[PDB]
DNA sequence: ATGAGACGCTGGCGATTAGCTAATCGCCAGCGTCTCATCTTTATGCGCC
């Protein structure tokens, strides 16, 4: 429910789009199932750059952590 | 062929004799703990019909 509004904006993307269903499961298995609690900075640095390899992330759904 | 009818110091004292709420104020109020769990609810932090 908290990951249904974590919106991802690619550096090449033209409009913000919420994370897709497979993307959510990817987030869960990579980070949300490894650490007790994941900060937004940690999700941005430890998932998007390792999987999507996006230069920068832009979250419009959760603040600080 | 006579013998009834016509009735007092009290009031103003003392002095017994007896008896009763009420107005003012002050005091002073059972309290001590812990455990255990149980749920809520609030402050801040995130979303558009």
From Swiss-Prot:
Disruption phenotype: Loss of correct processing of pre-crRNA and tracrRNA. Loss of immunity against a plasmid with homology to CRISPR spacer sequences.
Residues spanning the membrane: none
Function: CRISPR (clustered regularly interspaced short palindromic repeat) is an adaptive immune system that provides protection against mobile genetic elements (viruses, transposable elements and conjugative plasmids). CRISPR clusters contain spacers, sequences complementary to antecedent mobile elements, and target invading nucleic acids. CRISPR clusters are transcribed and processed into CRISPR RNA (crRNA). In type II CRISPR systems correct processing of pre-crRNA requires a trans-encoded small RNA (tracrRNA), endogenous ribonuclease 3 (rnc) and this protein.
Similarity field: Belongs to the CRISPR-associated protein Cas9 family. Subtype II-A subfamily.
Domain remark text: Has 2 endonuclease domains. The discontinuous RuvC-like domain (approximately residues 1-62, 718-765 and 925-1102) recognizes and cleaves the target DNA noncomplementary to crRNA while the HNH nuclease domain (residues 810-872) cleaves the target DNA complementary to crRNA.
Subunit structure: Monomer. Binds crRNA and tracrRNA.
Name of the protein this chain belongs to: CRISPR-associated endonuclease Cas9/Csn1
Gene: cas9
Whole-protein residues included: 522 to 586 of 1368
């Amino acid at each position: 429910n908290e990951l249904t509004k974590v919106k991802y904006v690619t550096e090449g993307m033209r409009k913000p789009a919420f994370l897709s269903g497979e993307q959510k499961k990817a987030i869960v298995d990579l980070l949300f199932k490894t650490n007790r609690k994941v900060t937004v900075k940690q999700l941005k640095e430890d998932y998007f750059k390792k999987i999507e390899c996006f230069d920068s992330v832009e979250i419009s759904g959760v603040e600080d952590r």
